[PDB]
Amino acid sequence: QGSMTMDKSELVQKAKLAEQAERYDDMAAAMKAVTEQGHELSNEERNLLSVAYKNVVGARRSSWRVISSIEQKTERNEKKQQMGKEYREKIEAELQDICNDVLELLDKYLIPNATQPESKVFYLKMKGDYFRYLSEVASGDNKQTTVSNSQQAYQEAFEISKKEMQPTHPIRLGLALNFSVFYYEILNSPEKACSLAKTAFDEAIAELDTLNEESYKDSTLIMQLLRDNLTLWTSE
């Protein structure tokens, strides 16, 4: 009953149980094992992998923000201040380990085996995302690298999505959402962020009257997030 005796269907069933149980380390381990079997993932499997690692890394992003805020407010106390720094650095190390695991899966298995543009865009978008999470905590020359790698991945995803996908496609939206956030939060470029988000939103409203009820729901959900961010940002 170990991962190396399970077939893909069993590993996916395990990932789905872990998801329901909110056991995201188990969920990630299952989908990592599926990925390492070396075949292209289905859309369902893609989403399971993404959800799992987003929650695993998200816990560390949240903890890091909390500890950073605590450091900002801690009174003078050499030992306490040192402990807070060391605890933040522990969380940073975990976060880097998680991102590297995902980035290794993307480079070794997912991206080289991706054939459909839709899957290439999804995986390059993920690559952009995980280098963006590394950026959030990086310093020095390491940060220059992670920022650059994030931008490059998003950019290639963006190019392919504009050529090969409909503007209403939830993956193309969502890529626009996240890339715009990269510009605003990481590159400190509000005008590029706003331009990207607005254009993506506009190209989408142009074609909402072509979608059946399910697709319409999926697209408008992400469009609302673009609008939400634009509202957040067009107040300055």
């Binding site: 959402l177 996240n178 956030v181 605003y184 939060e185 992400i222 997030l225 939400d228 961010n229 940002w233």
Partner: peptide, 5 residues
């Protein structure tokens, strides 16, 4: 924080 997906 801004929304991402």
């Amino acid at each position: 924080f801004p929304a991402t997906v």
